[PDB]
């Protein structure tokens, strides 16, 4: 538990989300590295993107 | 030194979809991989052996 909870959760959940493409995942991970304070914003963004990309 | 190494996404997706790991195991492998993605082959081999050892019987 040395990591910030929101940081670790964003990494795990962005890896877990099934409807992100690979480029989107990699972009979220680079953004997390760029600015870890943005972890909760980035997770919320990734979840909205995931839900917008469910197969029809 | 802050560039993201996309090897993390590839090996990370392989670990996180191993069906028999528990959540603490997945999370610890993933954070180890995040800290050094160059270790992907070693971590995947460890994770896959654990996944087998914990397969349903």
Author numbering:
A (entry chain A): 3 to 58
B (entry chain B): 2 to 58
From the manuscript:
We adopted the Z domain of staphylococcal protein A and its affibody binder dimer complex as a model system. We next generated libraries at the interface of a weakly associating dimer (Z+ ZSPA-1) with micromolar affinity to determine if we could affinity-mature the interface by coevolution. To clarify these inter-residue co-variations discovered from the sequence data, we determined crystal structures of 10 coevolved pairs that spanned a range of cross-reactivities and orthogonalities (5 from LL1 and 5 from LL2). From the structures, we could verify clear compensatory changes between the residues showing the most significant covariations (13A-9B / 17A-31B) in both LL1 and LL2 library mutants.
The first library, LL1, was designed to use minimal codon sets encoding both polar and hydrophobic amino acids (F, L, I, K, H, N, Q, and Y) for five positions on the Z domain and hydrophobic amino acids (F, L, I, V, and M) for four positions on the affibody ZSPA-1. Phe13B of the Z domain, which is a core residue of the central hydrophobic patch in the original dimer, was mutated to the smaller Ile or Val in both LL1 and LL2 library mutants, and this was compensated by mutation of the opposing residue Leu9A to the larger Phe.
